[model samples]
Target: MGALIPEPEVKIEVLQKPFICHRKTKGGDLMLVHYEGYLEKDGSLFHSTHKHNNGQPIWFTLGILEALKGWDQGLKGMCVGEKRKLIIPPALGYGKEGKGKIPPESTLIFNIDLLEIRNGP
Candidate 1:
């Protein structure tokens, strides 16, 4: 009914509200990332870094826009070998109508690890 709730544990700082990251690197700003995401309201796990069984990593370009706005914004300024956590509000995430497993107006939290940066062949 309401917008996704925020976590009380982490203090959020906003340089710009609903920001979007536009960093484009060679191979389209691809990075190997380990991420664990969860719902903020009940702290339910949506996705986890342990999903990788082969120990391989996840890869995607920065401008691909394949993820939520929060991830796109949070991933900005992240360098290879950097790890951080992100708390994403619904407006910057799934909005009022969540897709797939995410509930509508849900706030999501993610722990992200940037393992590597590489160029495409």
Candidate 2:
């Protein structure tokens, strides 16, 4: 007999809040992005759009290992001015062993606002 698949054991919660972003690229495609990332349970701040001390916009590629899996997937089909709140599980963000400021086996929540999208450099 085939082994029975176990029930899924995962939970998620999303917070609703206001966000704004404006990101541009050389291809004339706007890439709008505003993200505030935090560690779950402790609510520790790790990455954000508002943490800029020099007052500069935050910009990075969604995939190509520049962003977490959730952001990469979520931003793939997004338009230039899309806004969203993403709740990322450990499997999507960092699983078991977190990187840098994030702890191991941690979940991440991101308030992402797509301000623009640029097609090419």
Candidate 3:
């Protein structure tokens, strides 16, 4: 196992409370999720699974850098069907040099729905 990355500063607000689930996401779990990301400063939509990915849920291994640093930390302990709004600082998101359409040093906001979690091999 590699050294775990330190959790970043992220503000997570529950938008819709989920019914309790038997399983909650932990590190190394494969998470199936849908999300829309926007610029915190202007609330301009930067990306969305619904818009860009044909409404399909995206998958990621939680705690891994496959996603943004903020996501790795912020998405932890989430239950399936949970909805949340995440406010992410630049250091936890695109950082100083942001991705296409996202400005440099930008703070980001994401509306996320945790759809499923699967055990990873």
Candidate 4:
């Protein structure tokens, strides 16, 4: 027997609503998305796929360590073509050791576009 899994401890605030869709993203699904990340305090742009990747979508597997904790948990249950704003705390983000550009204990804000979702093997 398996134990019940718990949801991610992140805050998801929907900025733009989506149309009625049959399926929502779940763990173990491959997601293609575009995002612009910013520092929550001053709203400074930290990173963006559009700027860095020439407007290409980024791919990652949900519920996996391949992505940050905020992304792993916050993106769950999102429908295809949905847009959202995720407020990620330091614990779910960089934690004590921040990344190159991000500072320690900083909260992050991400404007995300969920382009597509596919089943993972």
Which candidate number has the best TM-score? 3
Q: How do the residues 7-118 of candidate 1 rate in per-residue lDDT, one tens digit apiece?
A: 3333233323223333323425778888778899999887776764355568867755767667667776665555677888888788899988799988888887777776
Top of the candidates by lDDT? 3
lDDT per residue, candidate 3, 1-121, as tens digits?
A: 3467665599999898666778888889998999999999999999999998998989889887888999986898889889999999999999999999998999999999998899986
Give me the runs in candidate 1 sitting further than 4 Å from their true place.
Answer: 1-27, 52-55
Candidate 3, after superposition: displacement of residue 26 in Å?
0.3
Consecutive 10-residue window with the lowest summed lDDT within model 3 = 1-10
> What is the Cα root-mean-square deviation between model 4 and the actual structure?
5.4
Compared with the true structure, all predictions reach lDDT values of 0.68, 0.62, 0.90, 0.87
TM-scores of the models, in the given order? Answer: 0.69, 0.65, 0.91, 0.88
lDDT value for model 1: 0.68
* RMSD, one per candidate, in order: 7.8, 5.7, 5.2, 5.4
Error of 4 at 88 (Å): 0.5
Q: How many clashes in candidate 4?
A: 0
Worst 10 residues of 4 by lDDT: 1-10
Residue 107 Cα positional deviation in candidate 3, in Å, after optimal superposition: 0.5
- How well is each residue in 69-95 modelled by candidate 2, as lDDT tens digits? 676655554545555666677877887
